[PDB]
Each structure stands twice: as C-alpha cells, then as structure tokens.
C-alpha cells in the first residue's frame, strides 16, 4: 500500500481563503522532508463556490512542485471536457520538465451540468468529447505532437513545447465518475481515482465493472494502481470528530448530490472513511481499500480543527509505514 | 529606473528543452537571493515552435514563485484573446494568495493569425474580443465576481475562488501590439510592455500615441511605469557577441515578422539593444528607454553562450544598481 495526501481546500464559515491555502502549503512542506514516507500529494479542482477554492489544480501543483524536493505532486481531477487538450498537454510537459519528472496528471470528466453550460459544452455528446479531448492530450504528452479532425476539434499537426521526457511513464489517473468513463478506462488499462464523496457500494461496483471490461478485452491490469482518497478525523471524543466531519462535507453534499437523501449520504460517508478515536479499528475503511483494488491511499486531515493534533497524527501514520 | 529579468526560452539547434528551462530556473534562484536588487522576473508565452518553448507562462511563474521568496514573478505576455477570462482570473487570484502577493499579470493580445485560427477566434472582432475578455478577468481579480452578457461571453454571475487580496493593486501590464491596444490601454491608464522584437521607431510611435490619447481623455499617466525588455550580449570580442545574438533571434524574426526585410530588421535590433563589448556606451539603448517612458528595464542574457560570463555580468549590473 502506497500512501499520499490530497487536499479539498474547503473554505468553511468564518475561514479565510489564506488560512485554507496556507494549511495545504505547510502540510506539504513538512511532509516533503526525507524522514516521511508519504510519496504523493494531490490537489482537487472545484469552481464557483467555497466548497473547494482551487480552480486550477495544475497551477497549484506547479507552485507546490517549486516549493518541494522529494514528493511527487499533481492534480487529482483536472477536468478536461471543459478545457482545451492542447493547453493541458503544454502544461503537463512543462511541469514534467521543470520538476524533473515529479508531476502526476490526475484527470476527470465533468461532473457538473452547470459547468458544461458555463463553458458551452454539449451535454448529449459529453462522453465523446471526453474521449476526443483525452486522445489529443495523450498524443501531445507521449509524442510531443497534436492533431485533430473530428466533430469537436479540427486543427493541423503541431508540436507541443517543451518536449516531455517522461512520455508514456508520466503517471495518469482517471476519476471514476460514471460507468461510461470506468469502462473506457478499463480498455486503456488506466488506473482509477475514486470520488471521495461516493458510497462504498458505488466504488466497489465501479471496480467490479472495471475488472469485467478489462477481462473481456484481454487487458492486463495486474499492476494497475487504483487510488482511494480517505478523509480522516481522529479525536479522543467520538462526537467531536463526527461533528467536525459533518460540518466539513455537508455543503458539498448538498451541492454535488442534490437528488439524494442528504442525511443518509453523510452518515454513510462517516462510516466509510476514518472518523473516530485513535483506538478504533476502521475495518470499514480497510474493507473499502481491499474491495476497490486500491494500492494507493490518499489522506486528508482538513476537517480536524486542531493543527497540533494533525501533525501528531501525520507522524503516527509515518511511523507505522516504516514498520 | 527599476531592473528585472525576462525569459524568451529559445531552444536553438542542438539545445535540449531541459537545458533551456534549467537556465531560467537557476538564474532566477540565484537572483532571488537578498544580496541582489533586481525586483521582478517575467516569463514569455509562445506556441508551436522552438522560438519560445514555454506555452503557459502563469504555470511557469507558479513554479518559480514556489522556488523563491523575494522576487516578484509573473507572465510577460499572457494572451487573453485565445484563452478563457474566468480561468485566468481564477489562476491569478490563486497565485496572489499562494505567493503572498508576488505574482505580476503581464497581458497581451494575440499577435499570430495562426493562433486565431487554431483556437477558433474571429479575426474581424479580435480587438473587441480582447476588450470583452479583459473586462471579465479584471472584474474577477478586483471584485471576485464575474458576469458577462455580450456576443463573446454570456454566463450568469459567479464568484472567483480563491479570494484575491491584492485586487486593484495586482500589477497588470499590457504588451504594446497595435495602435488599437495602445489607445485602449491609454484610456485605462494601464502600463505598457514593449515587444522586444519591434523597432525603436515603432515603440516611440506607440509611446507618443499613448501620451496623445491619455491627454485627450484627461487620464493621469504621471506614474505609469512602462516596461522595456532589453536583450544583452556582452563579449570582449564584439564580433562574437553580434553573431551569438544573430543566431538567437533569426528564427523568431522569420516566424513573427515574415513580410519584412529580415536583414534590416536584425541589424536594427542589434543597434537598439545592448550587443557589444563591456566598454561601449550603448547610448542607443538609453535613448530607447527615455523616448518610450520606460521606468522598468527587463534584462535577458540568453544569447550568451558562456553561462559563467552571464553571472559575472549580472553581478556587474547588480553593483551599479546600488550605486
């Protein structure tokens, strides 16, 4: 099991944008020192509300890459369906070059009908646009050349500067947002990142469909390293840890999952992730990792309001990784 | 006179993309140390050839900002006419927060008909699209809200995250690319960045048009700090320095100024900039600064083939800055 971090950067009531971003920056600076065994760190993308104040994860990763020396840093869910593939390919190659191969390209389809309207993207052809955008973006990263002649993009062959050194070995991840995307990803043998806010059953169902589609297409997925973003809030008072987590995720659940039972969605997430005391077992989270084929686990302690307890927790996790 | 740096990142024959980008990174790391009196550093944008291998100057500035603590760093010519204004506003506010107010937003209109076709932008409305795009990004940077209802952008009112602290005090510069842009910039009292590859007469004509339009509109321009990017190549052999500069700019001149006399254009640039020995006077470059109202000068030593001679020159300039 590989360990890493991920940051949602939620700006709750009374918090300032500066405090939220300072927390990410200081946590990554601390974990980047050699005594730690976390290997990766990811930045989440969100627009148009305080439930995630980072709208450009590759730009944020760039700053963090300039600030660090050991960690590999990247985007968790760079939405390509509302962006331009040539521009993303140019940024990925630049970060690969400037950071000496430490940038990770986590990708995502669009999951907000509002954003599809905002950026003038057709809803009914969304899946086809996601795949056309990926082919252009993947061409540029692995061959340093882009070309398009289809119903979404049409332009002559051009070179992508700077030239990418990693090429096919630049790590890419796909956010599991629908069966169409998961099946598309299985045929390409690309690793999945699961939506943190989804239910455990949803993630397990995605993984089982991923296994089925890969087997039908004779795709070798023995070394595909799926990723599980895990929210963590450990407090000696079980009620303190459970309430801080409810105050952290409630706004986003109402925003991103409006047609669901709000209260059940929240409670299911408290069970799935790690919210409790230091002496609990969290077998629901261990079950979650195993049954989704996740070989990387990404931690976020951002709901905990005591920063000294967070540093204490990071060191405890780090020591067990050494063992 | 304020001093700074700018980087064109030309990848000449035989050079690798890594060597070019390592030069910028190491030069900025050295100059950021406290003993230096350079204040700014800028990254140039270019696409689809090796005459400038950085396609995302704000992403490159982000990395450099993470690497440094003192210098203010930004884009030299972020083209807004082919980009989305809401995305730029989100990135600028993000960089303002993460770098503690050290990001500078140098902007530019599009100067390549190929790029206008590539990104599906109408040529006849280029000037009007440039102005509609600026209003959206400038609204978001100074008020954290964007709204549009015109023939280029139409979307409901949304907030820009993260919260921008600098707002109106976030320095903006406008690349002097045409009379239409210079006049538009004069009415807003915004400072100019001159195209390095233009003739001296062209820059003086831009400045004189800027003074005229500002006077006609009762705009206070007494403290507007225009910027002059100056290429530098100092070598004990005057003929070596002139050849290294000829080999540096020839490709770009052929690319960006195809319908002009190539040889006259190059020689005019050799006269305008600082290409010679250390004991020469360079009164043509001093005249250039004075007659363009430039209060900031940006230096680039990238044509010199001896990197140790470049550092020696940087120290010589630095000592003269502190008198």
From Swiss-Prot, chains A, B:
**What keywords sit in the KW lines?**
Flavoprotein, FMN, Luminescence, Monooxygenase, Oxidoreductase, Photoprotein
User: Which EC number applies?
Assistant: 1.14.14.3
Biological processes per GO annotation: bioluminescence
A GO CC term attached to the entry: cytosol
Question: GO molecular function: any one?
Answer: alkanal monooxygenase (FMN-linked) activity
Q: Does the keyword Oxidoreductase apply?
A: yes
Q: Catalysed reaction(s)?
A: a long-chain fatty aldehyde + FMNH2 + O2 = a long-chain fatty acid + hnu + FMN + H2O + 2 H(+)
Under the heading PANTHER family, the entry gives: BLR5498 PROTEIN, LUCIFERASE-LIKE MONOOXYGENASE
Q: Which family does it belong to?
A: Belongs to the bacterial luciferase oxidoreductase family.
Function text: Light-emitting reaction in luminous bacteria. The specific role of the beta subunit is unknown, but it is absolutely required for bioluminescence activity.
Oligomeric and partner information: Heterodimer of an alpha and a beta chain.
Question: What is the protein name stated in its UniProt record?
Answer: Alkanal monooxygenase beta chain
Gene source species: Photobacterium leiognathi
